[PDB]
Structures are given as C-alpha cells and as structure tokens.
Write an enzyme that holds these catalytic residues in place. Structure first.
Site, PDB file in Angstrom:
ATOM      1  N   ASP A  83      -9.318  -6.402 -47.968  1.00  0.00           N
ATOM      2  CA  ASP A  83      -9.961  -5.127 -47.688  1.00  0.00           C
ATOM      3  C   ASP A  83      -8.910  -4.039 -47.485  1.00  0.00           C
ATOM      4  OD1 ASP A  83     -12.044  -3.340 -47.270  1.00  0.00           O
ATOM      5  OD2 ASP A  83     -12.439  -3.965 -45.206  1.00  0.00           O
ATOM      6  N   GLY A 233     -18.715  -0.142 -43.864  1.00  0.00           N
ATOM      7  CA  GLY A 233     -19.155   0.381 -42.574  1.00  0.00           C
ATOM      8  C   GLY A 233     -20.613   0.104 -42.295  1.00  0.00           C
ATOM      9  N   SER A 235     -22.221  -2.569 -40.626  1.00  0.00           N
ATOM     10  CA  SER A 235     -22.766  -3.297 -39.488  1.00  0.00           C
ATOM     11  C   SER A 235     -24.024  -2.591 -38.992  1.00  0.00           C
ATOM     12  CB  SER A 235     -21.749  -3.380 -38.356  1.00  0.00           C
ATOM     13  OG  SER A 235     -20.831  -4.441 -38.570  1.00  0.00           O
ATOM     14  N   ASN A 275     -20.290  -4.749 -46.243  1.00  0.00           N
ATOM     15  CA  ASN A 275     -19.161  -5.087 -45.373  1.00  0.00           C
ATOM     16  C   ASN A 275     -19.603  -5.111 -43.915  1.00  0.00           C
ATOM     17  OD1 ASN A 275     -17.710  -4.898 -47.756  1.00  0.00           O
ATOM     18  ND2 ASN A 275     -16.177  -3.476 -46.925  1.00  0.00           N
ATOM     19  N   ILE A 276     -19.373  -6.239 -43.231  1.00  0.00           N
ATOM     20  CA  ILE A 276     -19.814  -6.425 -41.850  1.00  0.00           C
ATOM     21  C   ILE A 276     -18.673  -7.052 -41.046  1.00  0.00           C
ATOM     22  CG2 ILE A 276     -21.433  -7.595 -40.324  1.00  0.00           C
ATOM     23  CD1 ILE A 276     -23.451  -7.498 -42.706  1.00  0.00           C
ATOM     24  N   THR A 278     -17.924  -5.313 -37.325  1.00  0.00           N
ATOM     25  CA  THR A 278     -18.287  -4.918 -35.965  1.00  0.00           C
ATOM     26  C   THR A 278     -19.394  -5.786 -35.364  1.00  0.00           C
ATOM     27  OG1 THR A 278     -17.470  -2.675 -36.112  1.00  0.00           O
ATOM     28  CG2 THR A 278     -19.385  -3.017 -34.697  1.00  0.00           C
TER      29      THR A 278
END
Lengths: 350, 350
Positions: A83, A233, A235, A275-276, A278
């Site tokens: 990433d 970003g 989450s 994308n996860i 947090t």
C-alpha cells in the site's frame, strides 16, 4: 503454493459481481484473524502492508507471515499488496521482497504528503506498471487526493496523507481525469477520491451523499466499465467498538466511518477492492481494554491478544460476507505470475 | 542461513563459562524483542515453543517467525527448541517442522501431568535421542519433577505440570538418578528439579537455600562435569513490573521468582540453558496496561504493542548480559545438522 496476482482476483470479482476487502497487516494476530475469516467463508484474500508496517514488523517478518498463511491455508488464494508506495524504487523493492501487487501512489510526492501534478503522477505510475507487468505483478494507481470534502483534511495512514488544507477539486476525482489516467498508465486497479480519508475521524456526522460521493463512483464506472475501482479509507468505524473503548478506559469522541451499505453500492458500480485498517485497530483495542479490565490477575498476552484475533476475525467475516465473497475462493484457479507476465506481453490484459 | 543445534551452543557456553537464556516465543513482538536484544549484545539465541504456542500461533507461523529472524539477523546463530515434548511422536513431528532441538519431557506421562516411572522416562527419552541424533537434532531430557519443595505444587506451563501434591523426593533430583539417567539416555542437556516451578507464583517469600537447592546443582555438576544442565521455571519475576501491573488495573499478589544471582551461581556449576517465559509475559502486560492508561485516545495496536517489544527486549538484554553472553555470537562458527549427525555417528559427542 504461490501468491496470486491482484489483477486475477479483481477480474474474478468483476466477473462474479463482488468486491474484496483488503486488510492491512502488521503482526501475527492480525494475519491469523484475516486468514481464519477467509478460510471460514471460503473467500480469497488481499492482505496489504504499508511502509509503516515494514518499519514496525521488519520486511522478512511480513514476507514470512504471508508464507505461513499460504502454508496453513493452501486452498485460499492470497495477494500480498504494497500500500501507498512512495516512489518507483519503493515498488521495485517490494517486488524483490515477493509482493504480488503494488500501489504506486503518485497522487502525492515521495514525502507522502505533498499533492503531485498530473504529469508527475502518470510518469511514476506508468514506470511502475511497465516493470511490474514484466514480472506479472499488479499495479494500483491513484488519481485524486484523499480527504474530507467539508474540512479539506486527509488524515494520516501510517504517515501518508496530504498536508495542508485541500481544495474541493483536489479531493474529488473528475470523471475525465480518471479516463485520461487509466489511458495513460494501464493500471490494474484505480484508486479514486470521493470524500473518504484515513483513520477513525472520517465524518463528524453520518455521511450524506454530498460528502461521500458514491454518485461519482457511478459516473466513473459509466465512463470506464472495465476498470476495477479501489476505495481507500473505507473502514466503517463500528460504533459498538467505540462504545467498548470508551467504557474501558479509552476516549474516542463522536465520529463515523464509511457505511457498509454505501460500500456495497460502490461494488455494484465497479469497486472491487475496499481498504480496511482502522476497523481492525478499533476491534483490537476494544477487545484488549475489556479483557484487561475484566481479568486483572491475568498476565498471559495470549489471553488478551487472543481476544483481538476473535474481534478482528468477526470484522473480516462481516466484510467478506457483506461484500459477496462467500465461496469465491473455491472458484479461482490460480495463475502464476509468470503466466500473468505472458498475458500482459500479449496485450490480453489491456 | 540455517539453524544451529542446541548441543553446539551449549558446548560453546561450557567452553567459555557462560549460560544462555532460552526464551519462549508465541508471536511477532516476542520474536522481535528476543532477536533485537541478542543482536544488540551479539549473543547466540535459543528460542523455544510449547505445544500451547503451536495451538496459539499455528505451526507454520512459528516456523516462519524463526525463518524471518535468521534472515533479518544473519550473524546471530539461532536454535529453535521444542519445549515439554509429551511423547516421541511429538518430538518426531517437531523435527519434521524444522526444530533443531527437542525436549522429550519423560518426567511426566503424555498427559503432561502424571509423574512417570524412571523406566518410562528413560525409554521415551532414549527413543528420541536415537532418532534425533541421526538427524543432528539436540535432545533435552528431564529427571525429577518440577515443583515447589514446601507446597508440593508444580504450577502450569502451557498446560504442563504435575497434578496433585508431590513428594519431596519427586521434586528434588538425586545425584545418582541424574548420573544413571545421563548414562541411560545420552541426552545433550539435562533438566533437573531443584525447587523451581512454572509461572509467577514460585515462592511466597524470597527463596532460601532450603527451598531453591542450588547446592544440589553443585553436587550434580561434581558428579557429571561434562553434562549441560537446564534450569526450568527460572523467571526472576521482576518486582518493578509487578508494581506497574498493580498500578494500572491489574492485581498480582506478593510473589517471588528465581534470583538472577542464584542463576549465575548455577551457571558457574554447569547450568547452560535458563528457561524464561513468565518474565516476558509480565513485562508485556505491565507495558500494555501503562500505555493504555496514559493514552486513552490511542487505538493503534502498534503503539502499545511496541511498548511490549521494548519491555521484553530489556528483560532479554539484562539476562544475556548477566549470564555472560555478550559477544559470544561472533565466536561461533555454525555447524550444519548434517555434520552434527556425522559427529554423533562417530561417537564424538558421547
């Protein structure tokens, strides 16, 4: 068994109308949570690592965590994705370390904070596409700067994120810029900016269609029907884990993430990678705080860290199921990276 | 680079009048703490894993944590040792998984709780010695049952430890039993029982010479001048970390471990391997409790888990230095396990 390319997984996701969560990994408990969840629902895996993860874990440890995962779960195809690659040199090093996919984040300069020009972005990204495809390695690029459309703030994902207040035009990818960028770079996956940002503090209120521009995902998918879209970003920020953290010695103020319902709408319109990071951090911290409070005499890390495996595993399960991934691992016949390289050379993936 | 045999490391420790701590590992943070400490003081490494560690981490993950350690620290020789092997079959499986050393704990039956007869113990241990030495793999055996000489209680090390009250004679290895056992088994390392036990609750008062029988180590070393002795249950239980745990939401009553000063006396009399697990657990739990209390809004596991790396690393540094290990890694020329097997076959290690 070997790693699979991200392009193969995203092609399969588009063919079968699902999208994959891409979970950040930093250590053993996180990797076990991801793999156990994917094994339970027979889902393919994208695991990703930041530069901050390399600094924390060590590059040999990250590499060997993925090798252990493939050995213990041989029927689960695994992508290892770099990433927020800051430069072509970084992405080249990641290929040497055995990553099967890289993100050249050309939307920021090599400092990971200064927004780049279109030409800088295309030049860096095209460079990485050319040497990655020669090895069969997949490439994600980004056009648009991640950040909150009301505040102009991006947040920080392991030190990556725009510094200074951003303009509306910087933080919302235009349709024609996405079209030009894909034409100019040939990326396998396109990250776009539609109002998400890194971290827990994405929205001070439940996001509306004005601040979380799912409509722009639809527009980009209409222009680029064959491009796999990446939601950074994304989450969801589980309110139940915020409650636990606040009950057991923590303090996180009122904040909201990206709703699963809106991500699913994005998947209907070409989002194939979500994308996860947090959410796993929040689930982990809530689980440890609660266990330590309830078990003051227990000092075996495996007891409270085991609770983080289960808490993270439940997040991953929830996302795999909601995004349509159940059973898809059993449908995938892995293609070697050497064969992917051959397909790229023949123009079959253009 | 490959793993080294435990026999090579213990031979070097005896030649150079030092002793090695053997640290239990369960995950990435523990492995990094151990390796960073050993790298800092240029010490050789014995890392060990229990059956409970395999259940927690997964056998592929343990194997690959050690492979990553050797890759990142190529100048540090590493032993991977299987602690408390319950049966010959278990030890054989550990060799297949790439361990370079195994403990056949024949002092207990395969349940890990019932004390065994001398003949059972010798039969199991001799069996493991024969098939391990054929591969160059080192073997630790135990004669005597670990436990507290005043209470008759053994405690539990990952489910291993005598059940029921033990007799004085069971818990204190006699000199002649140690002599007969070494003659009958040919082990590379001999674990003996001198009043230590698993866990934090070793002694209710600072241990005296009556309850921690260092004098019996001296007697056994006089009878067996060439036998490398192993001290199980030899965490020191750092009072400063007990204080931190009690200050930040935990509750551990007054208890004492094995003093470093007494371990050093054991090393002067043939102790070459000192098993330490509980101290790293206590340092980890104190560090996490303190960080969470001081940083209520921080939910990044790397922040509080990073504090466990530093806390565990300081324990490991303290032990390597106190036990005489500084600089010894640079003196060791690793011998392959194939060459060790050849030396065993020629009778050179009898």
């Amino acid at each position: 068994m070997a790693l699979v390319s991200m392009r193969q997984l995203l092609d399969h996701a588009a063919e079968n109308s699902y999208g994959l969560p891409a979970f950040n990994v930093n250590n053993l408990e996180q990797m076990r949570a991801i793999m156990e969840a994917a094994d339970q629902v027979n889902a393919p895996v994208i695991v990703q690592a930041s530069a901050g993860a390399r600094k924390y874990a060590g590059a040999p440890f990250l590499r060997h965590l993925i090798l252990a995962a493939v050995e213990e779960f041989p029927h689960i195809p695994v992508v290892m994705h770099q990433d927020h690659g800051a430069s072509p040199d970084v992405c080249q090093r990641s290929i040497q370390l055995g990553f099967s996919s890289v993100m050249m984040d050309g939307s920021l300069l090599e400092d990971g904070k200064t927004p780049s020009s279109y030409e800088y972005n295309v030049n860096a990204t095209r460079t990485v596409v050319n040497f990655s495809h020669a090895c069969g390695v997949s490439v994600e690029g980004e056009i648009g700067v991640l950040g909150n459309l009301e505040t102009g703030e991006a947040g920080e994902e392991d030190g990556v994120g725009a510094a200074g207040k951003l303009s509306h035009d910087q933080m919302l990818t235009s349709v024609e810029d996405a079209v030009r960028f894909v034409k100019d770079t040939g990326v396998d996956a396109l990250a776009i900016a539609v109002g998400t940002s890194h971290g827990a503090y994405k929205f001070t209120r439940p996001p509306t269609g004005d601040v979380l521009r799912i409509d722009r995902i639809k527009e980009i998918h209409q222009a680029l029907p064959n491009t796999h879209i990446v939601m950074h970003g994304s989450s969801s920020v589980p309110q139940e884990w915020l409650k636990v953290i606040n009950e057991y010695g923590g303090n996180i103020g009122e904040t909201y993430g990206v709703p699963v319902e809106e991500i699913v709408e994005g998947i209907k319109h070409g989002v194939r990678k979500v994308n996860i990071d947090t959410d796993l951090r929040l689930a982990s911290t809530g689980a440890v705080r609660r266990y330590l409070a309830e078990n003051p005499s227990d000092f075996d890390p495996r007891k409270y860290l085991g609770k983080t495996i289960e808490a993270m595993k439940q997040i991953c399960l929830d996302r795999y199921l909601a995004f349509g991934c159940e059973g898809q691992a059993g449908k995938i016949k892995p293609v070697s990276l050497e064969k992917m390289a051959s397909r790229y050379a023949k123009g079959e993936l253009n």
